[PDB]
Amino acid sequence: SKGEELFTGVVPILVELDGDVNGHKFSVRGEGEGDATNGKLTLKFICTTGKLPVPWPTLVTTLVLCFARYPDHMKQHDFFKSAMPEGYVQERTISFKDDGYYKTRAEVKFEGDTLVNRIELKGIDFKEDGNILGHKLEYNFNSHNAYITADKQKNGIKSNFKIRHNVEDGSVQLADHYQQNTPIGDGPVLLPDNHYLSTQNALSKDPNEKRDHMVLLEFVTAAGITL
Numbered sequence: 001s002k003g004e005e006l007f008t009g010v011v012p013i014l015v016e017l018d019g020d021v022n023g024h025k026f027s028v029r030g031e032g033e034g035d036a037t038n039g040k041l042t043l044k045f046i047c048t049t050g051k052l053p054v055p056w057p058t059l060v061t062t063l064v065l066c067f068a069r070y071p072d073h074m075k076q077h078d079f080f081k082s083a084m085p086e087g088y089v090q091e092r093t094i095s096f097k098d099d100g101y102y103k104t105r106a107e108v109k110f111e112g113d114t115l116v117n118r119i120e121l122k123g124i125d126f127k128e129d130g131n132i133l134g135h136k137l138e139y140n141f142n143s144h145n146a147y148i149t150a151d152k153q154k155n156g157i158k159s160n161f162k163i164r165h166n167v168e169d170g171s172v173q174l175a176d177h178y179q180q181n182t183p184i185g186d187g188p189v190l191l192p193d194n195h196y197l198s199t200q201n202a203l204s205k206d207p208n209e210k211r212d213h214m215v216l217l218e219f220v221t222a223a224g225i226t227l
Contacts, residue, residue, distance in 0.1 A: 003083065008036075011035075011115050013115050014029075014116045015043065015117045017029075019121040027048045030045035036066070045059075045216065056139065057139065060216065061177060090105075096126075097174040099126055106118060107184065143201075144163060160176070161177050
């Protein structure tokens with residue numbers, strides 16, 4: 001299909017986030033590349049406004065599912081590429097157990113040859129000394145599966161899933177994600193049967209980078225529909 005064709009090689013990525021958590025405003029800018037044939041993302045993110053007021057791991061899911069590797073026998077269920085190049089809106093509510101919540105709205109679309117993810121984030125009702133505003137989460141990530149379902153009355157998809165963040169005292173901080181996606185343009189899209197995305201992440205630091213930053217490697221692969 002036309003949308004699939006845009007992802008057969010390596011695609012440059014730009015990410016721009018504008019955030020406000022408990023009134024503290026901040027911005028993140030990321031740059032890198034996506035390789036959907038391998039389901040592979042490599043990006044470096046910088047906090048352009050100074051210090052990040054929340055832990056980097058809490059922003060991973062917000063900071064491009066069109067780069068998932070869909071197996072050949074499942075390609076008719078790839079909503080994300082079907083919506084390109086005009087793209088889709090991705091909205092989430094992320095509820096941190098015993099703490100506040102993020103509300104996010106993003107547009108994911110091509111701008112020229114570059115795939116751009118432009119996000120607005122608001123964080124509300126966070127505890128001043130909790131795991132998020134208190135920077136008590138470890139700088140790492142766990143592997144996760146997230147189930148996708150069609151949303152007929154919106155001509156899009158929905159998903160809900162739990163992210164587990166490791167806490168410095170050995171406990172776990174749950175981040176409950178509710179997600180919806182809808183096309184920006186008027187062209188036909190592929191609405192999928194039920195399936196899931198399997199995701200892995202590795203977070204690191206650039207030893208010669210003095211700014212507050214995150215180096216991210218991510219793999220995303222679709223599964224859950226048999227031959």
